[PDB]
Write a protein that binds this DNA or RNA. Structure first.
Ligand code: CA
Ligand code: CA
Length: 293
DNA sequence: GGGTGTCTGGTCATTCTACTTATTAGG
DNA sequence: CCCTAATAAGTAGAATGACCAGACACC
């Protein structure tokens, strides 16, 4: 099936990844071969998404990545042109746009065949220094003067509604929390959450204004730390979160979790979450959602 | 006979998702 | 007071993101 290009870019801002390998090769005029790529790796349940992206782009190969994960990967230089042209017409907006543009600069370097020269390889490693995790130890030793790993901030309003639908199909979670309450029954609470590394702190705050609800929580795990955009006021969920993703449909297995999420929402609108059979019906919905189903 | 592009089949590292429970806010 | 909705700190762990080695393919 075909996939909307804004939903695609949004999804890519979530799970996508750009790569540039500068590997030592003795039989290389320049001493290094170079590989460019874009891949999306997901659990094997959502391999359907990967088939639609591939069918829409007409490029890339779907292959297993371990027992439980699958990847669509584009490495063939001619096929990267299709990637590039897509993201030029539907640019991303996360700090990953910086990597994409480094990805694209490398492509231009190669398109002019400058990767077959001492100076070209030199520019590619300088491009690579700012890409994702920067240069490897071998590459640092070989190019001990290429040191500037600093990068520029990306700031972009949400460009289209379908972007968020795609992005949320990546980083979102529609949760039904059951908390112990002083009562005959157990409180039921719908919680919508989207996490992101703090480089995109500003985009996370954008969602409050873009959606008209929610708050940001800061979470930490030793040296690592992320930001979560949450929505726990039922008002906002009944009127804002749910209607939006109903107008701009999600894709992949998260749609099912969403559709179950709204099933519980209806019950909580009918006040049946305070009844016996109510907490029984919702309880069963939670049980078959997310982990499970 | 170089020389370069592309694929197979992964693994490594952490940013995500998803799940707990304490606690306060509120009509 | 009540009974309930809503915010919040915290963490687990695996689905992500990023990188890896080797060999094949082609002009
Ligand atoms: Ca992501
Ligand atoms: Ca995802």
């Amino acid at each position: 099936s075909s996939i909307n290009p804004w939903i695609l870019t949004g999804f890519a801002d979530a799970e996508g990844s750009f790569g540039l390998r500068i590997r030592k090769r003795n039989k290389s005029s320049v001493g290094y071969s170079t590989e460019l790529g874009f891949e999306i790796k997901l659990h094997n349940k959502d391999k359907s998404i990967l088939e639609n992206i591939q069918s829409t782009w007409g490029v890339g190969v779907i292959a297993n990545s371990g027992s439980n994960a699958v990847r669509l990967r584009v490495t063939r230089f001619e096929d990267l042109k299709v990637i590039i042209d897509h993201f030029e017409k539907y640019p991303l907006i996360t700090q990953k746009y910086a990597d994409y543009m480094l990805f694209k600069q490398a492509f231009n370097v190669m398109e002019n065949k400058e990767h077959l020269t001492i100076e070209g390889i030199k520019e590619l490693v300088r491009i690579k220094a700012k890409l994702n995790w920067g240069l490897t130890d071998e590459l640092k030793k070989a190019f001990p003067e290429i040191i500037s790993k600093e990068r520029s901030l990306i700031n972009k309003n949400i460009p289209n509604f379908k972007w968020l639908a795609g992005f949320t199909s990546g980083e979102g979670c529609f949760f039904v929390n059951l908390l112990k309450s002083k009562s005959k029954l157990v409180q039921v609470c719908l919680v919508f959450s989207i996490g992101q590394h703090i480089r995109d702190k500003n985009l996370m705050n954008s969602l409050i204004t873009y959606l008209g609800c929610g708050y940001i929580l800061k979470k930490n795990k030793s040296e690592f730390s992320w930001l979560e955009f949450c929505v726990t006021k039922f008002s906002d969920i009944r009127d804002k979160i749910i209607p939006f993703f109903q107008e701009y449909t999600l894709i992949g297995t998260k749609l099912k979790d969403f559709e179950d999420w709204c099933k519980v929402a209806k019950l909580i609108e009918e006040k049946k979450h305070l009844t016996e059979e109510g907490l029984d019906e919702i309880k069963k919905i939670k049980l078959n959602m997310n982990k499970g189903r």
